[PDB]
Coordinates of C-alpha atoms and ligand atoms in Angstrom, one line a residue:
Chain A
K1 CA -18.1 20.6 198.8
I2 CA -14.9 19.9 196.9
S3 CA -14.0 16.4 195.7
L4 CA -10.7 14.9 194.7
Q5 CA -10.8 12.0 192.3
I6 CA -7.7 9.9 192.8
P7 CA -7.0 7.2 190.2
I8 CA -8.2 3.8 191.2
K9 CA -4.7 2.2 191.3
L10 CA -3.5 4.6 194.0
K11 CA -6.7 4.0 196.0
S12 CA -5.8 0.3 195.9
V13 CA -2.3 1.1 197.0
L14 CA -3.6 3.1 199.9
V15 CA -5.9 0.3 201.0
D16 CA -3.0 -2.1 200.7
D17 CA -1.0 0.1 203.1
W18 CA -4.1 0.4 205.4
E19 CA -4.0 -3.3 205.8
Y20 CA -0.2 -3.5 206.1
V21 CA -0.1 -1.2 209.2
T22 CA -3.2 -3.0 210.5
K23 CA -3.7 -6.7 210.8
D24 CA -0.4 -7.7 209.6
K25 CA 1.5 -5.5 212.0
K26 CA 4.2 -4.2 209.7
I27 CA 5.7 -0.7 209.7
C28 CA 7.4 1.6 207.2
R29 CA 11.2 1.0 207.0
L30 CA 13.0 4.2 207.6
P31 CA 15.0 6.0 206.3
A32 CA 13.4 5.0 203.0
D33 CA 15.2 5.3 199.7
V34 CA 12.8 7.9 198.1
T35 CA 11.8 10.5 200.6
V36 CA 9.3 13.2 200.0
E37 CA 11.9 15.8 198.9
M38 CA 13.4 13.6 196.2
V39 CA 9.9 12.9 194.8
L40 CA 8.8 16.5 194.6
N41 CA 12.1 17.8 193.3
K42 CA 12.0 15.2 190.6
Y43 CA 8.4 16.1 189.8
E44 CA 9.1 19.9 189.6
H45 CA 12.3 19.4 187.6
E46 CA 10.5 17.2 185.1
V47 CA 7.6 19.6 184.7
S48 CA 9.6 22.8 184.5
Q49 CA 11.6 21.2 181.7
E50 CA 8.4 21.0 179.6
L51 CA 6.6 24.2 180.7
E52 CA 7.2 27.5 179.0
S53 CA 4.9 29.9 180.8
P54 CA 6.4 31.8 183.7
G55 CA 3.4 31.9 186.0
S56 CA 2.8 28.1 185.5
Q57 CA 6.3 27.4 186.9
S58 CA 5.8 30.0 189.6
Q59 CA 2.6 28.3 190.8
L60 CA 4.4 25.0 190.4
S61 CA 7.3 25.8 192.7
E62 CA 4.8 27.5 195.2
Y63 CA 2.7 24.3 195.3
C64 CA 5.9 22.2 195.8
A65 CA 7.2 24.3 198.7
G66 CA 3.8 24.6 200.3
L67 CA 3.0 20.9 200.2
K68 CA 6.4 20.3 201.6
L69 CA 6.1 22.6 204.6
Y70 CA 2.6 21.4 205.4
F71 CA 3.5 17.8 205.3
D72 CA 6.5 18.7 207.5
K73 CA 4.2 20.3 210.1
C74 CA 1.3 17.9 210.0
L75 CA 3.0 14.4 209.8
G76 CA 3.2 14.3 213.6
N77 CA -0.4 15.4 214.1
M78 CA -2.6 13.4 211.8
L79 CA -0.8 11.0 209.3
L80 CA 0.3 8.2 211.5
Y81 CA -1.6 5.1 212.5
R82 CA -1.7 4.0 216.2
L83 CA 0.9 1.3 215.8
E84 CA 3.6 3.5 214.2
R85 CA 3.7 6.3 216.9
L86 CA 6.4 4.5 218.8
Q87 CA 8.8 4.5 215.9
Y88 CA 8.1 8.2 215.6
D89 CA 9.0 8.8 219.3
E90 CA 12.2 6.8 218.9
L91 CA 13.2 8.9 215.9
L92 CA 12.7 12.0 218.0
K93 CA 14.8 10.6 220.8
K94 CA 17.6 9.7 218.3
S95 CA 17.5 13.1 216.6
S96 CA 17.6 15.0 220.0
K97 CA 20.4 12.8 221.2
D98 CA 22.3 13.5 218.0
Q99 CA 21.4 17.2 218.1
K100 CA 19.9 17.3 214.6
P101 CA 16.3 18.8 214.9
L102 CA 14.0 16.4 213.0
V103 CA 12.8 17.0 209.5
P104 CA 10.0 14.6 208.3
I105 CA 10.7 15.2 204.7
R106 CA 14.2 13.7 204.6
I107 CA 13.2 10.4 206.3
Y108 CA 9.6 9.5 205.5
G109 CA 8.6 7.8 202.3
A110 CA 6.0 8.7 199.6
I111 CA 3.2 6.5 201.1
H112 CA 2.7 9.2 203.7
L113 CA 2.5 11.8 200.9
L114 CA -0.3 9.7 199.4
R115 CA -2.0 9.6 202.8
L116 CA -1.8 13.5 202.9
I117 CA -3.3 13.8 199.4
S118 CA -6.1 11.4 200.3
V119 CA -6.9 13.6 203.3
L120 CA -6.6 16.9 201.4
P121 CA -10.3 17.4 200.5
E122 CA -11.3 17.6 204.1
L123 CA -8.3 19.7 204.9
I124 CA -9.4 22.3 202.4
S125 CA -13.2 22.2 203.0
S126 CA -12.6 22.7 206.7
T127 CA -11.3 26.2 205.8
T128 CA -12.6 29.5 204.4
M129 CA -10.3 29.6 201.4
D130 CA -11.1 31.2 198.0
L131 CA -13.1 29.1 195.5
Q132 CA -10.6 29.8 192.8
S133 CA -7.6 29.1 195.0
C134 CA -9.0 25.8 196.3
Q135 CA -9.9 25.0 192.7
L136 CA -6.4 25.6 191.4
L137 CA -5.1 23.5 194.3
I138 CA -7.3 20.6 193.2
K139 CA -6.3 20.9 189.6
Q140 CA -2.6 21.2 190.7
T141 CA -2.7 18.1 193.0
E142 CA -4.5 16.3 190.2
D143 CA -1.7 16.9 187.8
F144 CA 0.7 15.7 190.5
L145 CA -1.4 12.6 190.8
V146 CA -1.2 12.0 187.1
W147 CA 2.6 12.4 187.0
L148 CA 2.8 10.1 190.0
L149 CA 0.6 7.4 188.3
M150 CA 2.9 7.5 185.3
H151 CA 5.7 6.3 187.5
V152 CA 3.7 4.3 190.1
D153 CA 5.8 1.2 189.7
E154 CA 9.1 2.9 190.6
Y155 CA 8.0 3.6 194.2
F156 CA 5.1 1.3 195.2
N157 CA 6.5 -2.1 194.2
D158 CA 6.0 -5.1 196.5
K159 CA 8.9 -7.1 197.8
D160 CA 7.7 -9.3 200.7
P161 CA 10.1 -8.4 203.6
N162 CA 10.0 -11.8 205.2
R163 CA 12.2 -13.4 202.5
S164 CA 14.8 -11.3 200.6
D165 CA 15.5 -7.7 201.7
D166 CA 14.8 -4.0 201.5
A167 CA 11.1 -4.2 201.1
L168 CA 9.2 -1.0 201.6
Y169 CA 7.9 -2.5 204.9
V170 CA 9.4 -4.4 207.8
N171 CA 8.1 -6.5 210.7
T172 CA 7.9 -5.5 214.4
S173 CA 9.1 -7.5 217.4
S174 CA 6.7 -8.4 220.1
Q175 CA 8.1 -5.8 222.5
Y176 CA 7.5 -3.1 219.9
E177 CA 4.0 -4.3 219.5
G178 CA 3.4 -4.4 223.2
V179 CA 4.7 -0.9 223.8
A180 CA 3.2 0.8 220.8
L181 CA -0.3 -0.7 220.9
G182 CA -0.8 -1.8 224.5
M183 CA 1.1 1.0 226.3
Chain B
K1 CA 8.1 -11.6 191.0
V2 CA 4.8 -10.7 192.7
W3 CA 1.0 -10.7 192.6
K4 CA -1.3 -11.8 189.8
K5 CA -4.7 -10.6 190.9
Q6 CA -6.4 -7.2 191.4
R7 CA -8.7 -6.3 194.2
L8 CA -12.5 -6.3 194.0
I9 CA -13.1 -3.1 192.0
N10 CA -16.7 -3.6 192.7
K11 CA -19.7 -1.5 191.6
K12 CA -20.7 0.3 188.4
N13 CA -17.3 1.9 188.0
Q14 CA -15.6 -1.3 186.8
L15 CA -15.3 -1.8 183.0
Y16 CA -15.5 -5.3 181.6
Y17 CA -13.7 -5.6 178.2
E18 CA -14.3 -8.4 175.7
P19 CA -11.2 -9.1 173.4
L20 CA -11.3 -8.9 169.7
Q21 CA -8.6 -11.6 169.5
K22 CA -8.9 -14.9 171.4
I23 CA -5.7 -16.9 170.7
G24 CA -2.6 -15.0 171.7
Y25 CA -4.0 -12.1 173.8
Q26 CA -2.3 -12.4 177.1
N27 CA -3.0 -9.1 178.9
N28 CA -3.3 -10.2 182.6
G29 CA -4.2 -12.9 185.0
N30 CA -7.5 -11.3 186.0
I31 CA -9.6 -13.3 183.5
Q32 CA -13.4 -13.7 183.7
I33 CA -14.9 -16.8 182.0
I34 CA -18.0 -16.5 179.8
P35 CA -20.1 -19.0 177.7
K36 CA -9.8 -3.8 183.3
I37 CA -11.0 -7.4 183.5
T38 CA -10.6 -9.2 180.2
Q39 CA -13.3 -11.8 179.5
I40 CA -12.6 -15.0 177.6
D41 CA -14.2 -18.3 176.6
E42 CA -13.3 -21.9 177.7
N43 CA -12.2 -22.9 174.2
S44 CA -9.8 -19.9 174.0
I45 CA -8.0 -21.0 177.2
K46 CA -8.0 -24.5 175.8
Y47 CA -6.1 -23.2 172.8
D48 CA -3.8 -21.1 174.9
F49 CA -2.8 -24.0 177.2
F50 CA -2.3 -26.2 174.1
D51 CA -0.1 -23.4 172.9
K52 CA 1.9 -23.4 176.1
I53 CA 2.2 -27.2 176.1
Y54 CA 3.3 -27.5 172.5
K55 CA 5.7 -24.6 172.6
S56 CA 7.1 -26.1 175.7
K57 CA 7.5 -29.5 174.2
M58 CA 9.1 -27.8 171.1
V59 CA 11.6 -25.8 173.1
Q60 CA 12.4 -28.9 175.3
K61 CA 13.0 -30.9 172.1
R62 CA 15.1 -28.1 170.8
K63 CA 17.1 -27.9 174.0
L64 CA 17.8 -31.7 173.8
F65 CA 18.7 -31.1 170.1
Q66 CA 21.2 -28.4 170.9
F67 CA 22.5 -30.5 173.7
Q68 CA 23.0 -33.6 171.5
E69 CA 24.4 -31.5 168.7
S70 CA 27.0 -29.9 170.9
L71 CA 27.8 -33.4 172.1
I72 CA 28.3 -34.6 168.6
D73 CA 30.5 -31.5 167.8
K74 CA 32.7 -32.1 170.8
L75 CA 32.8 -35.9 169.8
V76 CA 33.8 -35.3 166.2
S77 CA 36.4 -32.8 167.4
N78 CA 37.9 -35.8 169.2
Chain C
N1 CA -8.3 -35.6 169.7
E2 CA -7.4 -37.5 172.9
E3 CA -6.8 -34.1 174.5
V4 CA -10.3 -33.1 173.7
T5 CA -11.1 -36.3 175.6
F6 CA -8.8 -35.1 178.4
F7 CA -10.8 -31.8 178.8
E8 CA -14.2 -33.5 178.5
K9 CA -13.2 -36.1 181.2
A10 CA -12.2 -33.1 183.3
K11 CA -15.5 -31.4 182.7
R12 CA -17.4 -34.5 183.8
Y13 CA -15.2 -35.7 186.7
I14 CA -14.7 -32.3 188.4
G15 CA -18.4 -32.2 188.1
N16 CA -19.5 -28.8 189.3
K17 CA -19.3 -25.7 187.2
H18 CA -17.6 -23.4 189.6
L19 CA -14.8 -26.0 190.3
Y20 CA -14.2 -26.3 186.5
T21 CA -14.0 -22.5 186.4
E22 CA -11.3 -22.7 189.0
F23 CA -9.5 -25.4 187.1
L24 CA -9.5 -23.2 184.0
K25 CA -8.3 -20.2 186.0
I26 CA -5.3 -22.2 187.2
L27 CA -4.7 -23.4 183.7
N28 CA -4.8 -19.9 182.3
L29 CA -2.5 -18.5 185.1
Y30 CA 0.0 -21.1 184.1
Chain D
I1 CA -35.5 21.5 156.1
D2 CA -35.1 21.6 152.3
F3 CA -31.3 21.6 152.1
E4 CA -29.2 21.7 149.0
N5 CA -27.7 18.5 147.6
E6 CA -24.1 18.4 146.7
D7 CA -23.6 19.1 143.0
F8 CA -20.5 16.8 143.1
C9 CA -20.9 13.1 143.4
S10 CA -20.1 12.7 147.1
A11 CA -18.3 9.4 146.3
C12 CA -16.2 10.9 143.4
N13 CA -16.4 14.7 144.1
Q14 CA -17.5 15.2 140.4
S15 CA -20.7 16.5 138.8
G16 CA -23.1 14.6 136.6
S17 CA -26.5 12.9 136.7
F18 CA -26.5 11.7 140.3
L19 CA -29.0 10.4 142.9
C20 CA -29.3 12.4 146.0
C21 CA -30.8 11.7 149.5
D22 CA -33.6 13.7 151.1
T23 CA -32.1 13.7 154.6
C24 CA -28.4 14.7 154.0
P25 CA -26.6 16.8 151.3
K26 CA -24.8 13.7 150.0
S27 CA -25.3 12.9 146.3
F28 CA -23.7 10.0 144.4
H29 CA -23.3 9.0 140.8
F30 CA -25.4 6.1 139.5
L31 CA -22.3 3.8 139.4
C32 CA -21.1 4.6 143.0
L33 CA -23.8 2.6 144.9
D34 CA -22.9 -0.7 146.4
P35 CA -24.2 -2.5 144.3
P36 CA -24.6 0.4 141.8
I37 CA -28.1 1.5 140.7
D38 CA -29.8 1.2 137.4
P39 CA -31.0 4.7 136.2
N40 CA -33.9 3.2 134.3
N41 CA -35.2 1.5 137.5
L42 CA -35.3 4.3 140.1
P43 CA -36.7 3.3 143.5
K44 CA -40.2 4.5 144.2
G45 CA -40.4 6.7 147.2
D46 CA -37.9 8.6 149.4
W47 CA -34.4 7.5 148.6
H48 CA -31.6 7.7 151.2
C49 CA -28.0 6.7 151.4
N50 CA -26.7 3.8 153.5
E51 CA -25.8 6.2 156.3
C52 CA -29.4 7.4 156.7
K53 CA -30.6 3.8 156.5
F54 CA -28.4 3.0 159.5
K55 CA -29.3 6.2 161.3
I56 CA -33.1 5.5 161.1
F57 CA -32.8 1.8 161.8
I58 CA -30.7 2.2 164.9
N59 CA -32.7 5.4 165.7
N60 CA -29.5 7.1 167.0
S61 CA -29.6 5.0 170.1
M62 CA -26.2 3.9 171.5
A63 CA -27.7 1.1 173.5
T64 CA -29.4 -0.5 170.5
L65 CA -26.3 0.1 168.5
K66 CA -24.1 -1.8 171.0
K67 CA -26.7 -4.5 171.3
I68 CA -26.8 -5.2 167.5
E69 CA -23.1 -5.0 167.0
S70 CA -22.5 -7.3 170.0
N71 CA -25.0 -9.8 168.5
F72 CA -23.3 -9.6 165.1
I73 CA -19.8 -10.1 166.5
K74 CA -21.1 -13.1 168.4
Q75 CA -22.4 -14.3 165.0
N76 CA -18.8 -14.0 163.8
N77 CA -17.7 -16.8 166.1
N78 CA -15.4 -18.0 163.3
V79 CA -14.4 -14.6 161.7
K80 CA -14.3 -12.4 164.9
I81 CA -11.0 -10.8 163.8
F82 CA -12.6 -8.7 161.0
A83 CA -16.0 -8.3 162.8
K84 CA -15.5 -4.8 164.0
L85 CA -14.4 -3.6 160.5
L86 CA -17.2 -5.5 158.7
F87 CA -19.8 -3.9 161.0
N88 CA -18.5 -0.5 159.7
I89 CA -19.0 -1.0 156.0
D90 CA -22.8 -1.5 156.0
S91 CA -23.3 1.7 158.1
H92 CA -21.6 4.3 155.9
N93 CA -21.8 5.6 152.3
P94 CA -19.2 4.9 149.6
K95 CA -16.2 6.7 148.3
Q96 CA -13.8 6.1 145.4
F97 CA -10.3 4.7 145.5
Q98 CA -7.0 6.5 146.0
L99 CA -3.8 4.7 147.1
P100 CA -2.4 5.7 150.5
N101 CA -0.4 8.8 151.2
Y102 CA 3.0 7.3 152.2
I103 CA 2.9 5.2 149.1
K104 CA 2.6 8.4 147.0
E105 CA 5.8 10.0 148.5
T106 CA 8.1 7.0 148.0
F107 CA 8.7 7.7 144.4
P108 CA 8.9 11.4 143.2
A109 CA 8.5 10.8 139.5
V110 CA 4.8 9.8 139.9
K111 CA 2.4 12.7 140.2
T112 CA -1.3 13.3 140.9
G113 CA -3.8 15.6 139.3
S114 CA -6.8 17.3 140.9
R115 CA -9.0 14.9 138.9
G116 CA -7.2 11.9 140.4
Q117 CA -4.9 11.2 137.4
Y118 CA -1.7 9.4 138.3
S119 CA 1.1 9.7 135.7
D120 CA 4.8 8.8 135.6
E121 CA 7.0 11.6 134.3
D122 CA -15.4 -29.2 167.9
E123 CA -14.0 -30.9 164.8
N124 CA -11.9 -27.8 164.2
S125 CA -9.9 -28.6 167.3
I126 CA -9.3 -32.2 166.2
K127 CA -8.1 -30.9 162.8
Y128 CA -5.8 -28.3 164.5
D129 CA -4.2 -30.8 166.9
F130 CA -3.8 -33.1 163.9
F131 CA -1.9 -30.4 162.0
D132 CA 0.1 -29.8 165.2
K133 CA 1.2 -33.4 165.5
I134 CA 1.8 -33.9 161.8
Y135 CA 4.1 -30.9 161.6
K136 CA 5.8 -31.8 164.8
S137 CA 6.5 -35.3 163.5
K138 CA 7.8 -33.8 160.3
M139 CA 10.1 -31.5 162.2
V140 CA 11.5 -34.2 164.4
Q141 CA 12.2 -36.4 161.4
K142 CA 13.9 -33.5 159.7
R143 CA 16.0 -33.0 162.8
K144 CA 17.0 -36.7 162.7
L145 CA 17.8 -36.0 159.0
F146 CA 20.1 -33.2 160.1
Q147 CA 21.7 -35.7 162.6
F148 CA 22.1 -38.4 160.0
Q149 CA 23.7 -36.1 157.4
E150 CA 26.1 -35.0 160.2
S151 CA 26.9 -38.5 161.2
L152 CA 27.6 -39.6 157.6
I153 CA 29.8 -36.6 156.7
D154 CA 31.7 -37.1 160.0
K155 CA 32.0 -40.9 159.7
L156 CA 32.8 -40.4 156.0
Chain E
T1 CA -8.0 5.9 168.2
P2 CA -4.6 4.2 168.1
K3 CA -1.6 5.4 165.9
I4 CA 0.3 3.0 163.8
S5 CA 2.2 2.6 160.5
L6 CA 2.6 -0.3 158.0
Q7 CA 6.1 -0.9 156.8
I8 CA 5.5 -2.0 153.3
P9 CA 8.5 -2.9 151.1
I10 CA 9.0 -0.9 148.0
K11 CA 8.4 -3.4 145.2
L12 CA 4.8 -3.7 146.4
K13 CA 4.3 0.0 146.0
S14 CA 6.0 -0.4 142.6
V15 CA 3.4 -3.0 141.5
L16 CA 0.6 -0.7 142.8
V17 CA 1.9 2.3 140.9
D18 CA 2.2 0.3 137.7
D19 CA -1.4 -0.8 138.2
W20 CA -2.2 2.8 138.8
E21 CA -0.9 3.9 135.5
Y22 CA -2.5 1.0 133.6
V23 CA -5.8 1.9 135.3
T24 CA -5.7 5.7 135.2
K25 CA -3.8 6.8 132.1
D26 CA -3.4 4.0 129.5
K27 CA -7.0 2.8 130.0
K28 CA -6.4 -0.9 130.8
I29 CA -8.9 -2.9 132.9
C30 CA -8.6 -6.1 134.8
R31 CA -9.4 -8.9 132.4
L32 CA -12.5 -10.3 134.1
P33 CA -12.4 -13.1 135.0
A34 CA -8.7 -14.0 135.4
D35 CA -7.6 -17.6 135.2
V36 CA -6.4 -17.5 138.8
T37 CA -9.0 -16.0 141.2
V38 CA -8.2 -14.7 144.7
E39 CA -9.8 -17.8 146.1
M40 CA -7.1 -20.0 144.6
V41 CA -4.2 -17.9 145.8
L42 CA -5.6 -17.3 149.3
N43 CA -6.4 -21.0 149.8
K44 CA -2.9 -21.7 148.4
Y45 CA -1.3 -19.3 150.9
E46 CA -3.2 -20.6 153.9
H47 CA -2.3 -24.1 152.9
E48 CA 1.3 -23.1 152.6
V49 CA 1.5 -21.5 156.1
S50 CA -0.3 -23.8 158.6
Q51 CA 1.9 -26.7 157.4
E52 CA 4.8 -24.7 159.0
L53 CA 3.1 -23.9 162.3
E54 CA 3.5 -26.3 165.2
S55 CA 1.0 -24.7 167.6
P56 CA -2.7 -25.1 167.2
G57 CA -3.4 -21.5 168.2
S58 CA -1.2 -20.0 165.4
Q59 CA -3.0 -22.2 162.9
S60 CA -6.4 -21.0 164.2
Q61 CA -5.1 -17.4 163.8
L62 CA -4.0 -18.2 160.3
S63 CA -7.4 -19.7 159.3
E64 CA -9.5 -17.0 160.9
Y65 CA -7.3 -14.4 159.2
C66 CA -7.6 -15.9 155.8
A67 CA -11.4 -16.3 156.1
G68 CA -11.8 -12.7 157.3
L69 CA -9.6 -11.6 154.4
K70 CA -11.7 -13.2 151.8
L71 CA -14.8 -11.8 153.5
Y72 CA -13.3 -8.3 153.5
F73 CA -12.2 -8.5 149.9
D74 CA -15.8 -9.4 149.0
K75 CA -17.5 -6.8 151.1
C76 CA -15.2 -4.0 149.9
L77 CA -14.4 -4.8 146.3
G78 CA -17.2 -2.6 145.0
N79 CA -17.2 0.2 147.6
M80 CA -13.7 1.8 147.6
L81 CA -11.3 -0.4 145.7
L82 CA -12.0 0.4 142.1
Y83 CA -11.3 3.7 140.3
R84 CA -13.9 5.8 138.4
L85 CA -13.6 3.9 135.1
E86 CA -13.5 0.2 136.0
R87 CA -16.6 0.5 138.2
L88 CA -18.3 0.1 134.8
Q89 CA -16.8 -3.4 134.6
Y90 CA -18.2 -4.0 138.1
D91 CA -21.7 -2.8 137.0
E92 CA -21.4 -5.1 133.9
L93 CA -20.8 -8.1 136.1
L94 CA -23.6 -6.8 138.3
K95 CA -26.1 -7.1 135.4
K96 CA -24.7 -10.4 134.3
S97 CA -25.0 -12.0 137.8
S98 CA -28.5 -10.4 138.1
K99 CA -29.4 -12.4 135.0
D100 CA -27.7 -15.5 136.3
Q101 CA -29.9 -16.1 139.4
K102 CA -26.8 -16.5 141.6
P103 CA -25.8 -14.3 144.6
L104 CA -22.7 -12.1 144.1
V105 CA -19.3 -13.7 144.7
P106 CA -16.6 -11.1 144.0
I107 CA -13.6 -13.3 145.0
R108 CA -14.2 -16.2 142.6
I109 CA -14.0 -13.9 139.6
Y110 CA -11.5 -11.1 140.1
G111 CA -7.7 -11.1 140.3
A112 CA -5.6 -10.3 143.3
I113 CA -4.8 -6.8 142.2
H114 CA -7.7 -5.3 144.1
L115 CA -6.8 -7.6 146.9
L116 CA -3.4 -5.9 146.9
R117 CA -5.3 -2.6 147.0
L118 CA -7.2 -3.8 150.1
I119 CA -3.9 -4.6 151.7
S120 CA -2.6 -1.1 150.9
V121 CA -5.7 0.7 152.3
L122 CA -5.7 -1.5 155.4
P123 CA -4.0 1.3 157.6
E124 CA -6.8 3.9 157.5
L125 CA -9.5 1.2 157.7
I126 CA -8.0 -0.4 160.8
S127 CA -7.1 2.9 162.4
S128 CA -10.6 4.4 161.9
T129 CA -12.1 1.9 164.5
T130 CA -11.8 1.8 168.3
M131 CA -9.9 -1.5 168.2
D132 CA -7.6 -2.1 171.2
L133 CA -3.9 -1.9 170.9
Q134 CA -2.7 -5.5 171.3
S135 CA -5.0 -6.9 168.6
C136 CA -4.0 -4.0 166.3
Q137 CA -0.4 -4.9 166.6
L138 CA -1.1 -8.6 166.1
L139 CA -3.2 -8.0 162.9
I140 CA -0.5 -5.6 161.7
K141 CA 2.0 -8.5 162.2
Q142 CA -0.2 -10.8 160.3
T143 CA -0.4 -8.4 157.4
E144 CA 3.3 -7.9 157.4
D145 CA 3.8 -11.7 157.2
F146 CA 1.4 -11.9 154.3
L147 CA 3.2 -9.1 152.5
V148 CA 6.6 -10.9 153.0
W149 CA 5.1 -13.9 151.4
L150 CA 3.5 -11.9 148.6
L151 CA 6.8 -10.1 148.0
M152 CA 8.4 -13.5 147.7
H153 CA 5.8 -14.6 145.2
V154 CA 5.0 -11.4 143.2
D155 CA 5.5 -12.8 139.7
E156 CA 3.1 -15.8 139.8
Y157 CA 0.0 -13.6 140.3
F158 CA 1.0 -10.0 139.2
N159 CA 3.8 -10.4 136.5
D160 CA 2.6 -10.1 132.9
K161 CA 5.0 -12.8 131.5
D162 CA 5.8 -12.5 127.8
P163 CA 4.0 -9.1 127.2
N164 CA 4.1 -10.0 123.5
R165 CA 1.3 -12.4 124.4
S166 CA -1.7 -10.1 125.0
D167 CA -3.8 -13.1 126.1
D168 CA -1.9 -13.1 129.4
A169 CA -2.1 -9.4 130.0
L170 CA -4.1 -9.1 133.2
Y171 CA -5.5 -5.9 131.8
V172 CA -7.4 -5.8 128.5
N173 CA -7.5 -2.7 126.5
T174 CA -10.8 -0.8 127.1
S175 CA -13.5 -0.9 124.4
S176 CA -15.1 2.3 123.3
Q177 CA -18.0 2.1 125.8
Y178 CA -15.5 2.0 128.7
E179 CA -14.0 5.4 127.7
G180 CA -17.4 6.7 126.7
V181 CA -18.6 6.2 130.3
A182 CA -15.2 7.1 131.9
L183 CA -15.0 10.5 130.3
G184 CA -18.6 11.2 131.3
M185 CA -20.2 10.9 127.9
Ligands
LIG201 ZN1 -19.8 9.0 141.1
LIG202 ZN1 -28.0 9.9 151.1

């Protein structure tokens, strides 16, 4: 049984979100400023600048692309709370009306990536993967967590949407509430 | 700016830390009072609030001083 | 001096311990 | 285990007539102890260095160690700043004196030998608030002195 | 655990290297006791600082720092501050105070040269402990302030004025027994 030991501050950030999309009824403002792709490209670029071994950087880029594609394919299935699903559907409608097939990675913020990571242990232990492969995955995502916690106040700052602007979250109207929750 | 309080990082995992210096250590607003959460004593905060008060009165006096001295400079220029 | 009297008056008047803890927490936050 | 004692005085890395411990290979000159020992009056029984004294008293227990150091630093309610350091002296054995390394490499014409030769080629609160107010009054009077000097040089 | 450096001005290192030659090569020892002990100079400094501080907290920092500094000078003077030879002088005062029926008081006797030594060795001592970072930086700042003042006032306590008057030489020439024990004879 594998275990992933997230730093405490990111657990607090996750619980803070878990309240925000629950009984305060806010949602994630989209398209956010720092999507998933910018995060991971910055991570990989910064880590390849210091790493000298070839296989290290090969496994680095493999991890990057793999996390990317799996987020891309799983976001719709199991990363969204109940209240958000309506915004998701509306985004699909807009994309299909504009004839651009939807990519989750170029709209959604990093908080969903933290949601993914927080899930990841169950995702892996529900499978038949190799012990060494799952172990290297845990070590890898752990290094990603470390690099993320070094910059935690660049993405996850608080701004109180009800007063100034451009906070990471926004409020919903009563019609959006009614449709999304009480369809 | 924003919050000054952590969540309840309850259980065994939390680490309480006693300072070695008790007069100008600032560190947070998550203090815990005793006879990373940084413990402190009543007399310490007494001293720190006196520090705030007296530095504030000093800087207020200095602001009035620079105000009056600019006033006197612009008067003597006239 | 008279400020020691200030804080002792506060300790007596506010009365309970927990409420004095809250007073000091406010004072420290400031 | 009957280990060998260091033939160099562990405090001064030199040989001589030195007193050695029976639980560690550290040996020290008669003058190196703190306070130094008299060789005519040698202690009767097993002699150990300060380190072994601390090791046997604390019994290598981290919980008792933290308990005693916490109690002592509480006892330093007036000198708490140097408490952590002062708790380190009485636990460890002595060494002799050499000036720091970066001080050595500031001037090149000074040189060291392997022997160590250096050659050239409550009421306290009342008192504190009283000091506060007296210095504040002094400073406001000095500011008014600035102002009066200004007003006299500008009127005259 | 933390990593730091102490930015000492150069004239202090000069005084220390001069003391190093007078202690290590020319065989001169601190004239015990000096006229002005470390107690006098430290009380003088602390009295000369707090009268410039408005805040009560800064004055408490000053007083606790000076008290701890005297305490540390006392607790270390005999352990790692004195070279191989002068420890004889320390043992001499040891015997004398053992005959005097009075507990040892190292500050009220010595001069401030071994105090300057304490200041110089402060880096490794403070770094060898698990002290947190903020207090480390603060004590460093206090030491720097003390060294600014000492650099200002070097000559009153460390200058040998009129070296033609040997009675004011802080270091007396060693007698024969000092070199007899220092050479290991
Ligand atoms: Zn020795
Ligand atoms: Zn020993």
